[PDB]
Write a protein that binds this ligand. Sequence first.
Ligand SMILES: [Zn+2]
Ligand SMILES: [Zn+2]
Lengths: 63, 7
Amino acid sequence: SMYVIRDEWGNQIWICPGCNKPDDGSPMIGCDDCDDWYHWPCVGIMTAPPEEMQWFCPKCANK
Amino acid sequence: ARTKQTA
Ligand SMILES: [Zn+2]
Ligand SMILES: [Zn+2]
């Protein structure tokens, strides 16, 4: 898969695999396996996890 | 975990 787009300025824009919508500054969380980034509501995250806790997205969590 | 919020 590939969830990073580039705009005409060369900047990288991450797309959330849960909703196929871009990062819009609202809180996201990064998967410590595949490194895709998700919107918190899209993965049921309601507040920042403990700093020490790794987080894995639904796809990887079943792997 | 790794989190961000930009706006
Ligand atoms: Zn999303
Ligand atoms: Zn993952």
